[PDB]
Design a protein around this ligand. Structure first.
Ligand SMILES: O=c1ccn([C@@H]2O[C@H](COP(=O)(O)O)[C@@H](O)[C@H]2O)c(=O)[nH]1
Length: 124
């Protein structure tokens, strides 16, 4: 089974690299993390930081989520991330992504006990 925390790890953590592996990083990762199985996900962010560093964000700056909920947290430091965004040709079942490397503050939604990230909200 997959807990909300483990889902977040599968969708959003890639600690094994400090930055996106190559041109095809996103196509490969969106496939291998099983994100595009029933539709193309329009955007998905992978975080190139330790799991402990990301979990630590739930203790940092409380901010409003994009949906207006109040269980979101912005990282004090910026973090190495890759945004995978669909290209114009992308169309289920043939999802295609552009890979954009960035260093931004991340915003996550935290839930549970222990209080851990369950959604990747935004970067800024
Ligand atoms: O910068 C972003 C924005 C959105 N998402 C993913 O897209 C979903 C919703 O995006 P949106 O509703 O903000 O378009 C989020 O739940 C998250 O999984 C990201 O990974 N990175």
């Amino acid at each position: 089974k997959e807990t909300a925390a483990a889902k977040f790890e599968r969708q959003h953590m890639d600690s094994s690299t400090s930055a996106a592996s190559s041109s095809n990083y996103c196509n490969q990762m969106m496939k291998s993390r099983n994100l595009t199985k029933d539709r193309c996900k329009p955007v998905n962010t992978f975080v190139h930081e330790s799991l402990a560093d990301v979990q630590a964000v739930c203790s940092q700056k409380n901010v409003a989520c994009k949906n207006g909920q109040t269980n979101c947290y912005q990282s004090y430091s910026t973090m190495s991330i890759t945004d995978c965004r669909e290209t114009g040709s992308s169309k289920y079942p043939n999802c295609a992504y552009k890979t954009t490397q960035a260093n931004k503050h991340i915003i996550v939604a935290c839930e549970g006990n222990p209080y851990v990230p369950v959604h990747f909200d935004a970067s800024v």
